Structures are given as C-alpha cells and as structure tokens.
C-alpha cells in the first residue's frame, strides 16, 4: 500500500516537452488508484456468523460507489477531454500549456492538493475497515467504527469544489 517507484524512458525530443514533476504527479495518482484497487480486491477475495453478511453488503457497496466516482467521473472524463484538447493544439507552447492545465485539474478533482487534513483523512480511515473485515473469517466493534466515521464523513460532505455534490448521494 506504499512505496513502489516505477520509471519509464522517454526520448529526448519529447523529454524536453514533458516535465519531471509530471512523472511525479503520475506516480501520486497511481498511489491513489492502488488504494482503491486494494480495498476492492480485498473485499473481493472473501467467498453468530451471518452478521458478516450485513458487514459485507454495507461495505462492499460503499467502496464500489467510491470507485465509480473517482475513476469514471474524473479519470476518464478528463482523459477523454484531454485527447480532444491535444488534437486541437497548434503550438509548441500551447501544447505544454493545455497539458499543464490538464494536470492541475485532475490533481484537484481527486484531491491531492489543498485540505488533505480535512477531507482525505476520512477516506484514509475507512480503508482500515477493509483491513479489519479481511482479518475476521469483535464484529460489532467494526460497525461501531463505521457508523461514527461515516457520519463524520457525511457531516463534512454537506458543505460546498462546487462539484462535491456529484458524490453527495451516499
């Protein structure tokens, strides 16, 4: 869930176009993705006792709903926009400009700058539930965490950046 630096070798005529910090940004958004892949596959590997059924349904859903927002509405929307942008780029300067104006919006929508100690920490604490539910195979002490942190998340989500209503249905 942490570490993993992977590089790629780019030729010089395009390595003088694409920045080094751009590679660092790709790494950051990769890390964010890996946490979602982790929680989803971690709730995908599992196959009184039937209370874990409720604890499966109430959580597997919620993580998949988070997945549907973050992946599609940001990472595929803006990428399909980005191709349509670069096919209309007609200058050496403006291609770098529209490229950097793509990074600074996808790095915003998925929050990787500004107020990562007020919003992100809720996403941080709910993955530990995927750890705990993976361990068991006590049980109410995960739901006691879940309801409190969930209401903590929702009572933060109630404030409008105006695009934060696009997830406020959960």
């Amino acid at each position: 869930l942490d570490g993993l630096t992977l590089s790629y070798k780019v030729p010089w005529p395009v390595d003088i176009v694409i920045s080094l910090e751009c590679q660092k940004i790709y790494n950051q958004v990769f890390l964010l993705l890996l946490q979602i892949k982790w929680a989803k596959y971690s709730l995908d590997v599992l196959l009184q006792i039937h209370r874990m059924f409720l604890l499966r349904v109430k959580l597997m859903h919620f993580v998949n709903s988070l997945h549907n927002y973050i992946m599609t509405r940001i990472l595929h929307s803006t990428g399909l926009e980005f191709q349509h942008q670069v096919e209309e780029a007609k200058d050496l300067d403006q291609l770098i400009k529209i490229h950097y104006r793509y990074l600074s919006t996808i790095h915003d929508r998925c929050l990787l700058r500004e107020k990562v100690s007020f919003v992100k920490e809720a996403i941080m604490k709910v993955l530990n539930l995927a750890l705990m539910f993976a361990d068991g195979w006590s049980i109410e002490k995960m739901e006691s965490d879940f309801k409190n942190c969930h209401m903590f998340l929702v009572t933060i989500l109630n404030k409008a950046f105006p695009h934060l209503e696009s997830l406020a249905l959960s």
Partner: protein, 420 residues
Amino acid sequence: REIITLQLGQCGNQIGFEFWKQLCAEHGISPEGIVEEFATDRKDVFFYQADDEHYIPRAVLLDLEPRVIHSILNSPYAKLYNPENIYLGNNWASGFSQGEKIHEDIFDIIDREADGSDSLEGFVLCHSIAGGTGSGLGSYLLERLNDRYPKKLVQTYSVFPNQDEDVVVQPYNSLLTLKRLTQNADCVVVLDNTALNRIATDRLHIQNPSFSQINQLVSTIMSASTTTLRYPGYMNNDLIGLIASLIPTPRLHFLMTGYTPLTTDKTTVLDVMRRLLQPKNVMVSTNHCYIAILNIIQGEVDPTQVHKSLQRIRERKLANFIPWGPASIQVALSRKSPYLPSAHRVSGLMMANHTSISSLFERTCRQYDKLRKREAFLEQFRKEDMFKDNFDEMDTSREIVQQLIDEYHAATRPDYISWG
C-alpha cells in the same frame, strides 16, 4: 482470467455451439480457426493459441445418447476447436447413474485442459433443467467439480422449463437439480422459456420456429455478458469483479437478464436504463424489490449525460430497493463490438437480484407436492429404485428448497438482520 466452458445435454450443447459460433462472428477470425489478416482487442479471453493464426477455443463438449450432437458435429464450426472430447432415458436418475460410472474419464478430459490452462478463473456450465439426459448428469458433474475445485468459480446458464404445458417427472427433476444448484453452484443465471416465448411472439408471429430465434436472444445476452472481458474495459474484466457486487449472500445468487430491443428483425442512456427497469423489457418473467442491480451499456457514449441520467433515474422513483441495506443499480459502459455489422448500436444488459423468482420456485414446489401426493408421477423405474429405495432424498430436497423460500421471503422483509 481464463474460463473453460462446459456444455452437456442437447439444449446446452446447442447454446455452447451457438455462443462459440457467435464469438467467431464477433472476433476477426475464420470459422476454421484462422485469425484474419485484415485485423486493439483481445482474442485470448477463452482461446488456446496454436500457430496458424489459430486461437483454439477452450470448450469441453459432453453428450449422453446423442441426437443433436451429430448435427452439431457436421459443421464448419467444428474445425475451430474439438480437441477430440466427444464421449457418449429422460430422467434425472438416468443422467445421474450414467454419469456415476464414467465420471473418471470425462474428469481426465477436464484435467487435460486443466494442466493445459496456465491461467484459470472459472468454469461455465451450459445446462438445461428437465432436459432429460442433461438433468442428473449435470448436477452430478457439478458436485464433482465442486469437490475437486474449492479454488474455482462456477457459473451456470440454465433454462427454467415452463412453457404452460407430457412429462410428469419434471418438478422432481427441477427440484433435485435446484437443490444441487443452491448448494453446489457459485453463480446462477436463470431465464424463463415462457418469457422468451412471449418476446418471440412479440417481435414476430412465430410459434413453430421458436428455437432458432430463442438462440438469437440467448446469444445476444451471452455475448453481452462477456463483452467487458473480451474487449478491454476497466472493471469486471474478471468474472469475480462482476459477480461480487451481485451476490450479497450465497443464498441470494440467482441473476436476472435484460436486452433492450424487443424487435431486432438520439436515444440516451437514460432511456434504455429506465426501460431496462421495466419488466416488459426484462427477459425473465406483496411487492418485490431488487436486492442489487448492475447495468451494462455498450454503444454511443455521452460523457457527461451519464451522471445527468443517474440523477434522473434517482428522481424518477421507479425502483425502490432493499430496506435493510445500501442497494444501488450500478452503471457499466463498454465498447460496442467491432468486426460485425450491428443493428441497435446502443444495447443494454441488466444483472440483478430480485425476489420475484421465489414465486416460480413455489410454483414448482406446489406442483411437486400435488404430483407427490397424487402418486402416479415418479414413473417408477429401476434407476430411481437403485438410487433410493425409500425416495426420501427428494423429500429432503423439497425441505431444503422450502427453507430457501423462507429465506427469500425473510430477505423480502425490511428486517433481515436476524437469521431466518
């Protein structure tokens, strides 16, 4: 990953042939196995790679007292695969007893491709309920693969035999096979022969050539079931990623079907979404409410009107879900399939859990109770007497499926936090 597909019975081999022929149509390949040189996508989802631009499909065909298998045999679609796996009463006990003795050699044929397969995800059963030879044999083989493989997934495409009426041992066969289906299968895809007959009489006015057009609708649903895997998507590119949201508990694992045209002789994604909600467009026929739904769209992509439609199907309020849970109908978008001409460029598919099929199950249960009390409809052969002298296994099967009906009706309630 890779999935070995498993067909037995007359009807089940017909859909196996029809699906593999349709996948030959979908991919840029010849019916002889040769990949086309005018061809991006994956053609290795279920195919062993030989050299001569040959992706040999990984399918094992099984037969018992073969009639239609000979007509399947003489075909140009028999040169795509057939790694020489052909191997030879209409009761459940007939198929069960005849599978009993020969289980080892067909399982050796299984193990052949099992070590042949470097990668594996699951086994798909092409089954037919109350097909005679398919019944009993398929449930026995299902028990054997489950016993041998606790690491693999099993999904079964099976018919629900109801054509509004003669075979009188049919509820007995369906009862036993459904007992094996509930406790020895990981995934069930059910359809109504009555509902497909209804939609066939909708789109045309046929009554006799129903089988071939039923093959058309089932091939569309089976191809739509696999489009996210055969073409590179992003999620549910595995069986298990598709399956996991749909089953909240393995007593609720029976899955519903959908295809958005009625007649297959700009509309937004909202419209096919909202009418894939309608039960006249669902190909399977108190208040019943859905436990989880997943919908799949392949076609024209409106990049923002997805979430706009999502807010719309919310505030439409056509489908209220399970009370005791966060149950959503969920959206998947895939590429529309190249390499073939296509009418209805937008096409939709629903997988859901609904409580409505417990009615069909109690229908079969009540018919079984009637025929069992009336006592002329077990048809008293040597197969059934050697299998069970006292015939209590059917009674146990009815008990278990009645328990399952009770579980269904208790899940139907707003309170299913307590057991039962």
